[PDB]
Design a protein around this nucleic acid. Structure first.
Length: 79
DNA sequence: AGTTCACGT
DNA sequence: ACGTGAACT
């Protein structure tokens, strides 16, 4: 339903990462930027229950090595 | 490991 | 409307 949900699922499929896998990779970035992230929050992202806010869109962009705009976009193409 | 929801913001 | 942990499967 949401763009973020489709962008996360795309990364999960391409890099064979589970939710817990992406969650663990964000941990060093969480302590660094002071932006916490629980597993229930990530779960709602993937399932279009809720969209990430300003701080967590940045957090996930750094973790997955993608741009904030791509993570918020409809586009399928990396850059 | 992943999901739902009352609650605080 | 957003994140979170309790409680859940």
């Amino acid at each position: 339903k949401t763009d973020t949900s489709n962008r996360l699922k795309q990364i999960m499929a391409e890099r064979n990462l589970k939710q817990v896998d992406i969650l663990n990779l964000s941990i060093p970035f969480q302590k660094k930027f002071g932006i916490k992230l629980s597993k229930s929050t990530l779960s709602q992202y993937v399932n279009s229950v809720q969209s990430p806010d300003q701080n967590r869109i940045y957090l996930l962009a750094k973790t997955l090595g993608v741009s904030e705009a791509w993570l918020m976009g409809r586009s399928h193409h990396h850059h």
